[PDB]
Amino acid sequence: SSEKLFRIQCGYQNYDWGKIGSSSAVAQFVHNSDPSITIDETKPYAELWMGTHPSVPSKAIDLNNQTLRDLVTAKPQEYLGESIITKFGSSKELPFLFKVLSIEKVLSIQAHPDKKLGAQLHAADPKNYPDDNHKPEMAIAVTDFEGFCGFKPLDQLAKTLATVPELNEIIGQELVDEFISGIKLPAEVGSQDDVNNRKLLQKVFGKLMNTDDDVIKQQTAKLLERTDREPQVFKDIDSRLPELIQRLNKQFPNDIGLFCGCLLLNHVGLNKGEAMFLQAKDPHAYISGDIIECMAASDNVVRAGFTPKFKDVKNLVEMLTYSYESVEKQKMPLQEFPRSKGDAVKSVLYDPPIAEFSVLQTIFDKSKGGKQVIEGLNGPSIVIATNGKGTIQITGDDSTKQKIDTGYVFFVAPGSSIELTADSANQDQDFTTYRAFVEA
Numbered sequence: 001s002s003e004k005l006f007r008i009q010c011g012y013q014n015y016d017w018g019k020i021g022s023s024s025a026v027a028q029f030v031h032n033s034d035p036s037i038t039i040d041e042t043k044p045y046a047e048l049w050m051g052t053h054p055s056v057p058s059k060a061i062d063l064n065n066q067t068l069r070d071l072v073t074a075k076p077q078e079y080l081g082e083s084i085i086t087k088f089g090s091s092k093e094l095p096f097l098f099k100v101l102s103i104e105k106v107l108s109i110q111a112h113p114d115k116k117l118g119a120q121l122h123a124a125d126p127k128n129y130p131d132d133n134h135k136p137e138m139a140i141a142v143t144d145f146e147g148f149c150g151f152k153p154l155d156q157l158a159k160t161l162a163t164v165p166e167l168n169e170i171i172g173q174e175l176v177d178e179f180i181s182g183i184k185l186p187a188e189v190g191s192q193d194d195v196n197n198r199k200l201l202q203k204v205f206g207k208l209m210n211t212d213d214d215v216i217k218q219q220t221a222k223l224l225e226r227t228d229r230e231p232q233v234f235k236d237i238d239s240r241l242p243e244l245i246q247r248l249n250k251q252f253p254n255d256i257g258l259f260c261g262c263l264l265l266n267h268v269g270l271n272k273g274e275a276m277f278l279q280a281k282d283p284h285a286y287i288s289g290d291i292i293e294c295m296a297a298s299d300n301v302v303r304a305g306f307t308p309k310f311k312d313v314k315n316l317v318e319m320l321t322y323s324y325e326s327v328e329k330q331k332m333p334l335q336e337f338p339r340s341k342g343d344a345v346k347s348v349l350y351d352p353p354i355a356e357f358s359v360l361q362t363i364f365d366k367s368k369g370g371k372q373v374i375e376g377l378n379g380p381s382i383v384i385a386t387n388g389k390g391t392i393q394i395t396g397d398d399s400t401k402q403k404i405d406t407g408y409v410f411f412v413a414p415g416s417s418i419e420l421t422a423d424s425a426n427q428d429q430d431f432t433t434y435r436a437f438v439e440a
């Protein structure tokens with residue numbers, strides 16, 4: 001039992017939107033790692049939490065089952081290092097939380113606070129806002145993924161406002177006119193034209209979000225009818241849109257998210273391996289797929305639709321920046337990672353412009369196999385295997401060699417060089433790992 005490289009058994013969340021039972025990647029990974037856990041086949045397994053966030057612990061199975069949070073707290077210098085202790089301001093915890101999500105139904109229409117709102121929300125309602133942190137995040141598609149992310153460009157929103165009768169009726173023609181006349185493009189971010197564009201978009205969004213629920217139920221029914229009788233109205237906005245509306249209405253009948261997500265937010269698809277980042281306060285809602293997520297350590301979320309959980313429409317309306325930048329600006333270029341070398345066919349850094357984390361992906365071909373060696377990184381890491389199997393060890397110390405099968409999660413102490421090996425008695429699954437880490 002090395003304290004440098006060691007297995008962790010991570011807790012999970014059974015949120016409603018999760019894939020059910022053994023069809024969930026969360027359930028699969030949990031059970032794989034600890035075959036003694038009985039998967040409840042009737043239950044959703046939505047999120048695997050890998051981290052030191054107090055809401056869900058990770059336990060070091062060969063270090064007397066103590067929690068990762070406790071182990072950090074007992075030895076901050078060894079587990080975090082002074083650079084991470086100083087930059088992020090804690091001796092107790094990781095500044096990131098790393099997750100697997102396995103999504104069956106769309107998540108809440110949601111936004112996470114920045115630092116200022118984080119502190120204010122936590123102070124005003126610590127029950128619903130359980131810490132004071134911000135939560136920028138990143139998603140990496142493990143299977144093909146869809147989600148909502150950011151307000152659509154203004155010309156698309158103007159078109160939608162003019163051509164979708166059920167939305168136009170909720171907003172009212174005077175406000176639709178005010179919005180469509182008033183917007184000015186191009187507008188540089190920060191310019192008075194931009195400021196005014198955002199104020200107009202906030203007026204439209206607030207009018208929608210504060211509409212009486214019985215009105216929303218009446219208009220959603222008519223919207224749904226219209227996707228059937230006049231699909232082309234919807235396809236002219238975006239070709240996937242009538243089917244989207246139909247599919248989400250089956251999940252959450254007559255939900256306000258049919259207006260506020262489907263009509264106002266970009267519908268993003270990510271192919272497997274593609275990724276996107278979300279700065280704090282970007283509005284979003286993940287629709288489908290299995291993903292890796294990494295975020296600043298927080299569970300603050302303001303929700304406003306597609307959920308039975310706590311909704312706070314007024315905070316949502318007030319906090320959003322109302323940016324309408326193209327969503328392509330937050331799809332990430334994949335980068336090379338010099339500090340890893342070997343036989344892996346993919347070795348890919350996902351490093352968004354967010355201080356609290358990066359993620360390194362490693363993939364070995366099923367037939368080719370081989371070994372990859374990664375230098376010690378200047379901060380704590382979590383590694384998960386999402387596919388295939390192999391072995392993991394501290395480089396040059398064969399006594400630390402351990403099996404790493406699908407779903408196994410390991411902590412790696414700062415400075416510790418790692419060597420991965422693909423299983424060789426095997427030629428059918430590409431051994432694949434994701435490692436979340438941070439460096440000042």
Ligand SMILES: NNC(=O)[C@@H](O)[C@H](O)[C@H](O)COP(=O)(O)O
Pocket residue numbers: 015047099107108109110137284286293301303307309
């Ligand atoms: N974008 N994804 C996330 O922020 C997830 O990590 C959080 O856990 C979300 O809060 C999950 O969505 P619900 O609150 O259950 O609607």
Ligand SMILES: [Zn+2]
Pocket residue numbers: 110112137284
């Ligand atoms: Zn989120």
